[PDB]
């Protein structure tokens, strides 16, 4: 509905199935590519390296409570690259440290069928 646009924002900001690891150069490139450095440098962002459909599938795991108190969150273990703004970055040269790992994540899902719409934690 308007959930699709939330879903697309999520894909853009958090899904890169093609890579699997992350070095600093990846973050600097991808943070720009995915439009998270156009105005200011987004300080921290997580990219998930899994197939869109493996991710969508998390929405079918047991419901758990989000940080905002809603019950539509779901937890799962996935390959990520986390990008942090370095101490040497400025706008427009936004600059980052990658931190690749396989880790638990929590996503809000909404809709019918249920798609991910929001990274909770
Ligand atoms: N590793 C993470 C975890 C969460 N968020 C952000 C994504 C969401 O946009 C925001 C919460 O707001 P929204 O309700 O728009 O999802 O937190 C992020 O950028 N990087």
Q: Where are the domains of the chain?
A: 1-121
CATH number of 1-121: 3.10.130.10
Q: How far away, in angstroms, is 88 Cα from ligand 1 center?
A: 23
| Substitution site in 118, 120, 121 for ligand 1 pocket (most atoms within 8 Å of beta carbon) | 118
Which tokens go with 70? 């809603």
Q: 84 - beta bridge partners?
A: 44, 97
Q: Are 78 and 103 in contact (CB under 8 A)?
A: yes
Distance between CA 74 and CA 68 in Å, rounded?
13
Cα–Cα nearest to 59, from 6, 15, 111, 11 = 111
Q: 103 - beta bridge partners?
A: 78
Per the annotation, the verdict on 39 as an active-site residue is no
Cα–Cα nearest to 36, from 4, 13, 14, 10 = 13
Q: Are 63 and 71 in contact (CB under 8 A)?
A: yes
Structure's resolution in angstroms: 2.6
């Amino acid at each position: 509905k308007m959930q699709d646009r939330m879903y697309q924002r999520f894909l853009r900001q958090h899904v890169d199935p093609d890579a699997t690891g992350g070095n600093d150069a990846y973050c600097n490139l991808m943070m720009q590519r995915r439009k998270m450095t156009s105005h200011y440098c987004k300080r921290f962002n997580t990219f998930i390296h899994e197939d869109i459909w493996n991710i969508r599938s998390i929405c079918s795991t047991s419901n758990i409570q989000c940080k905002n108190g809603q019950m539509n969150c779901h937890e799962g273990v996935v390959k990520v690259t986390a990008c942090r703004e370095t101490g040497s970055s400025r706008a427009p040269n936004c600059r980052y440290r990658a931190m690749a790992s396989t880790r638990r994540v929590v996503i809000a899902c909404e809709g019918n069928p249920e798609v991910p719409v929001h990274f909770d934690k």
